[PDB]
């Protein structure tokens, strides 16, 4: 086509979606990771994660307001990944990289799994 | 912080949100622009438009599944802007620029209003 494109649009949309999450506006699901609860927007979770895409395209699960993750999932790892979904920034540290990578494999977030593998390889 | 950032994340999120819209997945509102109907995600509309942000933060309107726009709004202008919200690309043409600018002023999409004003000024 002959369209023009606003370079910062996608980043500005994501920033506004994170502001809605902050302010708990139109959040429609609670993700439970053992004793912790995280509120989010189903559409953002599906856009970032192959696991959430599969969950919320299921004719029964699409209607659930609470999703319980596998008890082996680390709440801090999930929190770091949820922040990444809404900001593009990943708080990857020596002390959390193993939990983050395991969580990203479970959530099916291939680009995160890729950077974790590279950072681990560099330390070996 | 000491975060790393995935450059293409915001663009990839927006591309996936547009794929959900295409496939009518988790769309939660119908916008009526006279005889036409457009299905969308309230969160994407709020993230892009000051008018939708004001509508869906209202304690009564946040619960509506149908929103009727002012009868003066052109459906093609709205369609072009809805596509821009989900893709960052604006199909601006000599034949639609006046309707697009009027719609963007109504929807409170300041960056679109800005490029329309510049394109109009260039033709004068």
């Amino acid at each position: 086509d002959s369209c023009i494109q606003f370079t910062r649009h996608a980043s500005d949309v994501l920033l506004n979606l994170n502001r809605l999450r902050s302010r708990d506006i139109l959040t429609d699901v609670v993700i439970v990771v053992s004793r912790e609860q995280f509120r989010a927007h189903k559409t953002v979770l599906m856009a970032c994660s192959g696991l959430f895409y599969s969950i919320f395209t299921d004719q029964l699960k699409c209607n659930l307001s609470v999703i319980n993750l596998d008890p082996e999932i680390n709440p801090e790892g999930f929190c770091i990944l949820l922040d990444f979904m809404y900001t593009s920034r990943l708080n990857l540290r020596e002390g959390n990289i193993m939990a983050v990578m395991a969580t990203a494999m479970y959530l099916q977030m291939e680009h995160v799994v890729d950077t974790c593998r590279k950072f681990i390889k560099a330390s070996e | 912080d000491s975060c790393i950032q995935f450059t293409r994340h915001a663009s990839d999120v927006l591309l996936n949100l547009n794929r959900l819209r295409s496939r009518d997945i988790l769309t939660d509102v119908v916008i009526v622009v006279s005889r036409e109907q457009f299905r969308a995600h309230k969160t994407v509309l709020m993230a892009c438009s000051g008018l939708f942000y004001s509508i869906f933060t209202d304690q009564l309107k946040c619960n509506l599944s149908v929103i009727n726009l002012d009868p003066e709004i052109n459906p093609e202008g709205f369609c072009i802007l809805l596509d821009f919200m989900y893709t960052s690309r604006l199909n601006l043409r000599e034949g639609n620029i006046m309707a697009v600018m009027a719609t963007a002023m109504y929807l409170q999409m300041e960056h679109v209003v800005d490029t329309c004003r510049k394109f109009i000024k260039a033709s004068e």
Partner: peptide, 4 residues
């Protein structure tokens, strides 16, 4: 704004 750019030409994509």
């Amino acid at each position: 704004w750019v030409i994509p």
